[PDB]
Amino acid sequence: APDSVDYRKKGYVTPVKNQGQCGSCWAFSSVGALEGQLKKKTGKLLNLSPQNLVDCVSENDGCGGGYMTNAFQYVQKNRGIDSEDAYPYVGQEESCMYNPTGKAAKCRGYREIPEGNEKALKRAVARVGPVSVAIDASLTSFQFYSKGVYYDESCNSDNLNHAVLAVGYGIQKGNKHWIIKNSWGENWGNKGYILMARNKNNACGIANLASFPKM
Numbered sequence: 114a115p116d117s118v119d120y121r122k123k124g125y126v127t128p129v130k131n132q133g134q135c136g137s138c139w140a141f142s143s144v145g146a147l148e149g150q151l152k153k154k155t156g157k158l159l160n161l162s163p164q165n166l167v168d169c170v171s172e173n174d175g176c177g178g179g180y181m182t183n184a185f186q187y188v189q190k191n192r193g194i195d196s197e198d199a200y201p202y203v204g205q206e207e208s209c210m211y212n213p214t215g216k217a218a219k220c221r222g223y224r225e226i227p228e229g230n231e232k233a234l235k236r237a238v239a240r241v242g243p244v245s246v247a248i249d250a251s252l253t254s255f256q257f258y259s260k261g262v263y264y265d266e267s268c269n270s271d272n273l274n275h276a277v278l279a280v281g282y283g284i285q286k287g288n289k290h291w292i293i294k295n296s297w298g299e300n301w302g303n304k305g306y307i308l309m310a311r312n313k314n315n316a317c318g319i320a321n322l323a324s325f326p327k328m
C-alpha cells in the first residue's frame with residue numbers, strides 16, 4: 114500500500130455536509146463510501162441521498178440511528194439509491210419516497226474490514242478508496258478539535274457513538290494518521306475534517322466497525 118493516500122486530491126470526496134439534528138451520521142458515512150466507489154466506476158463525482166437511506170432502510174432507525182452495512186444492503190436489494198438532487202435531505206423522518214428515475218448508483222454488497230485491524234483498514238483504503246468507519250466521538254477534545262493529529266487516552270474503542278468516513282491516511286510531523294471526513298459542517302474542525310491517530314492501538318475504535326460497499 115502507498116505510504117499516504119488522500120482521495121480528496123483524487124476527486125473521490127464530495128463536499129462536507131451537515132447532518133443537523135437527525136441521527137443520520139451512519140447515512141452520511143454510507144453515502145460517502147458510495148460516492149467514492151461511484152467516482153471510481155464512472156469518473157463522475159455525485160452527491161448521493163442520505164435522506165433516501167434514512168426514510169427507506171427499514172432495518173435501521175431513521176433519525177434514531179443505524180448501521181452502515183444495513184444501508185449498503187438496502188441499496189443492493191433495492192437495486193439502487195437516488196441522488197441528493199432527486200431526494201434532497203430534510204433532516205427528519207418522512208416516508209420512503211425513493212424514485213427510480215432518479216437512481217444515481219447501485220451496490221453489489223459490502224466487505225467488512227477485520228475488526229481491530231488497522232493495517233487491514235489501510236490496505237482497504239489504499240486499494241478501494243474511502244471507507245465507512247465508526248468511532249467514539251463523545252470526548253470534548255474531539256468536538257473542539259481544530260488542528261493536529263487527534264489523540265486522547267480517554268477514547269473508548271467500545272463506545273462507538275458516531276459514524277464517519279476514512280478518506281485516506283498519511284503522516285503530519287512524525288505522527289501517522291487517518292483523514293476523516295465528518296458530517297458536522299465545513300465549519301467544524303479542519304474544514305469539516307480531522308486527522309486521527311493511526312497505529313495507536315486502534316484509537317477511539319477507528320477499526321472496530323469499518324466496511325465498504327462493492328460497486
Ligand SMILES: *[C@@](O)(CNC(=O)[C@H](CC(C)C)c1cccc(-c2ccccc2)c1)CNS(=O)(=O)c1ccccn1
Pocket residue numbers: 132135136137138139172173174177178179180181247248250251273274275276322
Ligand atoms: C449518528 O448521527 C447516529 N448514530 C448511529 O447511527 C449509531 C451507530 C453508528 C455506527 C455509530 C446508533 C445509535 C443507536 C442505534 C443504532 C441502530 C442501529 C441499527 C438499527 C437501529 C438502530 C445506531 C451519531 N453521531 S452524533 O449524533 O454526531 C454523535 C452522537 C453521540 C456522540 C458523538 N456524536
